[PDB]
């Protein structure tokens, strides 16, 4: 499922802004 | 017609403060350091207590030397200049600002309810009426900011605080800019970047409307529309012109999101002849009483548990670092107007 893919990803924590 | 009238007076108030900014309104010695609430590219945010009043505040601390190294001087000056000039119910208030030899300080109202981000990840997702309640507050906020020629550029759940009444306050104006034409800076959060930013084009306020589409999707699904392990893979997804919606999304929610997450600028909602009204009059918002949201009369779907004005249970724990003040002034000329 997409939820399981998101949870197993490296981007579930706070995301830093880029510049 | 009353919106036009309200915004005209809002512009007059803003322009007075924009042209003559408040400067040096407090000093570090007037605050008691409590706890680090967060650290990021935005430097650090500290919970502090103002000794003269006993009020708690969230103090954003920026190291002048680090801002210079990151080429963020103009962005930092924009942030403070804009924040001290704005006034809206869904915007965090800048209470004080000052600088010393080493750092810049922005003292903001403290929201112990914490970030929408933490609640969203824990709960998993918000039901459509719950997501709609927050989305309506963002719609009104952008209508206010855009009328002042301001582009926000960093919409995400991490930047949305939940107040004691369950309403939101937008924080972090680090990338906010006052611009009448187009702009070109590559800035924002990977998941929330409009395709025109990724493709190095000149862009305008329409990027904030695309970011609203990403936020609504994330609140209602529990995950963003474009995600991957690395930013590059996220950028490829964004520019591909393809989006997949969970089966639980209503027909109205999907229609609204196809119009916000629209790669074609001549077709993106918020950017057409009818402006914000294409969004406000969409079927997904038929139940939204815009005045009642603005007036904070609508019952909030979620209210954070009140544990005291200085409670930090809604924030994570960070390593406590000193607030070092050099005996020598750093970057004096660069931050003269702060
Ligand atoms: N106001 C605020 N009241 O509590 N936290 C506030 C806040 N103000 C901020 C300004 C800029 C970036 C993050 C900010 N946070 C969230 C903290 C986790 C870092």
Numbering used by the authors:
A (entry chain I): 5 to 23
B (entry chain A): 13 to 350
Could you share sentences copied from the article?
The 70 KDa ribosomal S6 kinases (S6K) RPS6KB1 (S6K1) and RPS6KB2 (S6K2) are key effectors of PI3K/mTOR-regulated signalling, and have been implicated in a variety of human diseases including diabetes and cancer. In order to generate a more robust crystal system suitable for the generation of high-resolution protein-ligand structural data required to facilitate S6K inhibitor design, we decided to develop a S6K1 chimeric protein based on the catalytic subunit of the closely related AGC kinase PKAα (PKA). Our PKA-S6K1 chimera was created by mutation of five residues in or near the ATP-binding site (F54Y, M120L, V123L, L173M and Q181K) that differ between the two kinases. Co-crystals of purified PKA-S6K1 chimera with PKA inhibitor peptide (PKI, residues 5-24) were successfully grown, routinely diffracted to between 1.5 and 2.0 Å resolution, and ternary complexes with inhibitors could easily be obtained using soaking experiments.
In agreement with the results of Bandarage et al., compounds 15b, 15c and 15e with the respective ethyl, cyclopropyl and cyclopropylmethyl substituents were most potent, but the N-methyl analogue compound 15a was about six-fold less active. The crystal structure of the PKA-S6K1 chimera bound to 15e shows that its cyclopropylmethyl group fits snugly in a hydrophobic pocket formed by Gly50, Tyr54, Val57, and Phe327, as proposed by Banderage et al., and suggests that this pocket is too small to accommodate the benzyl group of 15d. Superposition of 15e on the staurosporine-bound S6K1 structure shows that the compound also fits in the native S6K1 ATP binding site, but owing to the disorder in the S6K1 C-terminal tail and the different conformation of the P-loop, the presence of the hydrophobic pocket binding the cyclopropyl group could not be verified. Acetylation on the exocyclic amino group of the aminooxadiazole moiety renders this series inactive against S6K, as shown by compound 16, with an IC50 value of greater than 100 μM. This is consistent with the binding mode observed in the 15e-bound PKA-S6K1 structure, in which the oxadiazole group binds to the hinge by the formation of a hydrogen bond between its N-2 atom and the backbone amide group of Leu123 and through a hydrogen bond between the exocyclic amino group with the backbone carbonyl of Glu121. Although the closely related acetylated compound 16 could in principle still form these hydrogen bonds, in this binding mode the acetyl group would clash with the gatekeeper residue Leu120 and Val104, situated at the bottom of the ATP-binding site. The carboxamidobenzimidazole 1 is the only inhibitor which binds in the selectivity pocket, whereas the benzimidazole-oxadiazole 15e and azabenzimidazole-oxadiazoles 21a and 21e bind in a very similar manner exploiting the small hydrophobic pocket formed by Phe327 from the C-terminal tail, Gly50 and Tyr54 from the P-loop.
